[PDB]
């Protein structure tokens, strides 16, 4: 249950009808998302614009009650504002109640191939170029397994399979896709962070990879291999060596990644 409070006007910091939801990050992150994955979907569905802020931001600068550090990100007090029509807000409210009962997450579908000469498998990876307006925990370029996030009402595996296709053009069958758990590592200051659900699936080693089918320009592609292999960054050089500039994808071993980080 979400209790909304109607406001007469927005506060000055937010320069339509306005409602407020006073809650915790444990719930607020489900209607927002680090990159507004869910906020944008809510806007798409209802026209309602969502804004979030920590209610007591000074507490986020504390290391050590009722006025010191928060124990966990989940405990962070969050004030959510909704701007829209009465009808949009009515509809958006309904969607949020459903969302906080779902568990919207990031998904990663680890596509892997087996090499004859090796017991360690190779993982398909991409490098996503991130926007200039991004939370501080996200680097300029994310090296990642394929996969994005669950849409509202979407099941985990369904989302993994759909977003694998969006990033790589690869179609896998659900019966070959295996969930393998989740990771969720965060701190109170990064209260927006969400769990990541993992899956694995084997593909044949000679499978044809097309690359991103959706927003392809948000991924590294068509770099200058000669130039990039002169980068001071070990990942850049491994990327120039192993990635296909036409697809923005590389087959990589975790052990090789570990050796680069030393």
Numbering used by the authors: 77 to 90, 94, 96 to 144, 156 to 353
Study text:
MERS1 was shown to be the factor responsible for catalyzing the 5′ processing event while MERS2 and MERS3 activates its catalysis. Interestingly, the MERS1 Nudix motif (KWTLLYERYKEAAIRTLWEETGI) lacks one of the key metal ion coordinating acidic residues, which in MERS1 is a threonine instead of an acidic residue. The MERS1 structure reveals that it is comprised of two α−β domains.
Apo MERS1 crystals were grown and the structure was solved using the MERS1–GDP structure (after removing the GDP molecule) as a search model in molecular replacement (MR). A clear solution was obtained and the structure was refined to final Rwork/Rfree values of 18.8%/20.9% to 2.30 Å resolution. The apo MERS1 adopts a different crystal form with distinct packing compared to the MERS1–GDP structure and as a result we did not see the fortuitously bound helix in the apo structure. Comparison of the apo and GDP bound MERS1 structure revealed that the N-domain and most of the C-domain have the same structure; the two structures can be superimposed with a rmsd of 0.9 Å for 260 corresponding Cα atoms. Specifically, in the apo structure density was absent for the region encompassing residues 354–380. This region contains key residues involved in nucleotide binding, including Arg356, Tyr360, Arg364, and Tyr365. In fact, the RNA is deeply embedded in MERS1, raising the question of how it gains entry into this binding site. This appears to be explained by the apo MERS1 structure, which revealed that a key part of the RNA binding region is disordered in the apo state. The binding and stabilization of the single-stranded RNA may thus occur concomitant with the folding of MERS1 residues 354–380.
